[PDB]
């Protein structure tokens, strides 16, 4: 009683039940570095302004 | 202190748009309004300073010097008007272009409280000199004159700005308010031994000293008379003003490094005194005669006392007179002549009494005859010299000896005797020569009435 599948079947992306747990590393990865501070805030104004030699702005 | 700064800046449009026979007038009567404005930051403080604003600000050294300066530029104009008056109005306009932007130059340049643009207007007025002495310069040696006047000023001139941008790094500011109130001892040290060389020798180059100072005698001989003049009177002192500001930093590795500049000054002046004694040119004579008068100056910044900045800058300030009114009078006798040698045109005293008189009185306030500024000056730096070593007396009355003689021998060799018989176009002196003589005298004679207008900050 075996029916040949048809053209286009056998190339189908199926589900399976299984019990085996998911791998959660399997990468084997480290601890990623942490990351830059980011920092925010509000822009004033530059403290007595360029500050390039004697410009007073 | 942009009320002397813009109407300086306000003199070129005034030039430019002035009608072709008018512009002699206009600039003459501007710079005298622009003289009597600027002499009211005579009135100092003994406190600290006029600080005006973050970028300019007056003292009591720089004040004299500001209003030669400003004084200096209506003489420049009347000593021209004579040998450019065949020129085009669009030349004489770029003459006087020249002498208004050297005029500004000058002036930003002694108020400055940044060392960064002190060094920048310091160089600035490099350019318009340079421009005077090439192009309106009569003989085919200007060109050469001016390549040494450069390259001299510059090989001394770019360490300076390395170690001051240096220093920046180090300290945080150039302000010479900070600096002088920050100011650290100097260690004796290589690394500080450079910084100290090259902090110094660009305003050495340019007083100039003995050693380097052959530049001068080729950009004098070689340059117009206005050229000589502000050569002679404001740019050489240039090198004093920037010694006295900076040496606040160079402590007191100054005792040690001060050795050699001092032996060569002592011993210089000696030298270029008895060269003006073998000299068959007039103008190369009164340029040898300012080496020695700046080589006694650099005598007394190096030795640092209050006496020797009292006596330096007296001595700026009557050098600078003295010397403007010497090269003007040696400046009409080659107008007539066209020779420029002292030998050829004699017994001019028969044939040029009043021009004899002025003569005689440049010749006695160069000999600094009491109670001159200029004897004030040599005084001063004379006994602060006897105090560091009682055998400098030696030299600095050599020194007097050989000036007197060679002041007498110029007078002698040109007025007296009998005059030269094949010489026949000479003319009665001008009334803009008469004037321009006077109009250099009588500043000097009221000045001895007041002299602590021009004894710096440390009276
Ligand atoms: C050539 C010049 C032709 C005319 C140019 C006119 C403006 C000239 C400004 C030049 C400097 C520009 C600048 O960056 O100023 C900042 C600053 C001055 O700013 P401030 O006056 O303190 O401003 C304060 C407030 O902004 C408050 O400012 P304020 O209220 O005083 O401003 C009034 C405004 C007046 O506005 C008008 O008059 C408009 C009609 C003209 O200013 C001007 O227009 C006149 C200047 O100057 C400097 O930082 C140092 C400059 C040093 C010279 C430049 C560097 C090179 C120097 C060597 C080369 C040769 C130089 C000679
Ligand atoms: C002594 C007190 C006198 C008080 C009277 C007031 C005098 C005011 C004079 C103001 C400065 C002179 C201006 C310079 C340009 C000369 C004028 C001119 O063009 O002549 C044409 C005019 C018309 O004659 P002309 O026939 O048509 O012309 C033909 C030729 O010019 C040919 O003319 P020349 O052959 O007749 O010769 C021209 C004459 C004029 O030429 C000059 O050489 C005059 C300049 C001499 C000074 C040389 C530089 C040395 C630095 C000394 C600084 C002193 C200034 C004090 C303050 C001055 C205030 C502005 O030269 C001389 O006679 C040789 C005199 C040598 C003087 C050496 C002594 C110096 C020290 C004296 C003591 C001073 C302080 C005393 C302190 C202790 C006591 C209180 O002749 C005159 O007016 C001659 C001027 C008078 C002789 C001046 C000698 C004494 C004056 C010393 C300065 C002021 C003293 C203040 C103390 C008062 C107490
Ligand atoms: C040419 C026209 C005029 C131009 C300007 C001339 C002025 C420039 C002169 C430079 C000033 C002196 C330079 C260094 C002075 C320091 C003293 C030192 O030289 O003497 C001894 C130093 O010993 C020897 O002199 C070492 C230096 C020898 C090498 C220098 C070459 C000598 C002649 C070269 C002259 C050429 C000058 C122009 C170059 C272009 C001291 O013994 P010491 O206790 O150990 O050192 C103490 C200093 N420390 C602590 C910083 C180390
Ligand atoms: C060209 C090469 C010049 C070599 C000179 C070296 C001087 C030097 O490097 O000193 C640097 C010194 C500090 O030392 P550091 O390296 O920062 O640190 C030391 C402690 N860890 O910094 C300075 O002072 C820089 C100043 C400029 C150096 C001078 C260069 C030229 C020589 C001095 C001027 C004298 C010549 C003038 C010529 C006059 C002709 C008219």
Known sequence: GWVRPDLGELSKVTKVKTDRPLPENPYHSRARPEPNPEAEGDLKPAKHGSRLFFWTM | ?459
Not at chain 2, 30 to 59: A, M, V, W
Not at chain 2, 288 to 295: E, N
Request: glycine share 4%; with cysteine; aromatic share 10%.
């Open chain 2, 1 to 459: 202190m942009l009320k002397i700064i813009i109407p300086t800046t306000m003199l070129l449009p005034m030039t430019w748009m002035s009608k072709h026979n008018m512009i002699w007038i206009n600039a003459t009567v501007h710079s005298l309004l622009i003289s009597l404005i600027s002499l009211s930051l005579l009135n100092q403080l003994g406190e600290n300073s006029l600080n005006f604003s973050l970028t300019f600000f007056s003292d009591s050294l720089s004040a004299p010097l500001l209003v030669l300066t400003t004084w200096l530029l209506p003489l420049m104009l009347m000593a021209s008007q004579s040998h450019l008056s065949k020129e085009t109005t669009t030349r004489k306009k770029l003459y006087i272009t020249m002498l208004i932007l050297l005029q500004l130059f000058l002036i930003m340049t002694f108020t400055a409280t940044e060392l960064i643009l002190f060094y920048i207007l310091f160089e600035a007025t490099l350019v318009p000199t340079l421009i005077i002495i090439t192009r309106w310069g009569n003989q085919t040696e200007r060109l050469n004159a001016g390549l040494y006047f450069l390259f001299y000023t510059l090989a001394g001139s770019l360490p300076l700005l390395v170690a001051l941008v240096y220093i920046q790094n180090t300290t945080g500011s150039l302000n010479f308010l900070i600096i002088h109130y920050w100011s650290h001892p100097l260690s004796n040290s290589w690394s500080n031994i450079f910084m100290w060389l090259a902090c110094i020798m660009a305003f050495m180059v340019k007083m100039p000293l003995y050693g380097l100072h052959l530049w001068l005698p080729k950009a004098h001989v070689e340059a117009p008379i206005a050229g000589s003049m502000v050569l002679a009177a404001v740019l050489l002192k240039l090198g004093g003003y920037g010694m006295m500001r900076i040496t606040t930093i160079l402590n007191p590795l100054t005792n040690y490094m001060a050795y050699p500049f001092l032996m060569l000054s002592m011993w210089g002046m000696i030298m270029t005194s008895s060269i003006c004694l073998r000299q068959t040119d007039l103008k190369s004579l009164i340029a040898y005669s300012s080496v020695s008068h700046m080589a006694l100056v650099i005598v007394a910044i190096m030795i640092q006392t209050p006496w020797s900045f009292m006596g330096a800058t007296a001595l700026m300030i009557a050098h600078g007179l003295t010397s403007s009114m010497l090269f003007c009078l040696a400046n009409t006798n080659y107008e007539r002549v066209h020779s420029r040698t002292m030998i050829l045109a004699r017994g001019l005293q028969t044939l040029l009494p009043l021009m004899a008189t002025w003569w005689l009185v440049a010749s006695l306030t160069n000999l600094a005859l009491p109670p001159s500024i200029n004897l004030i000056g040599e005084l001063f730096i004379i006994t602060a010299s006897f105090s560091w070593s009682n055998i400098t007396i030696i030299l600095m009355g050599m020194n007097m000896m050989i000036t007197a003689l060679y002041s007498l021998y110029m007078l002698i060799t040109t007025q007296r005797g009998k005059y030269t018989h094949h010489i026949n176009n000479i003319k009665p002196s001008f009334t803009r020569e008469n004037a321009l003589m006077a109009l250099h005298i009588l500043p000097l004679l009221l000045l001895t009435l007041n002299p602590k207008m021009i004894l710096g900050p440390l009276y």
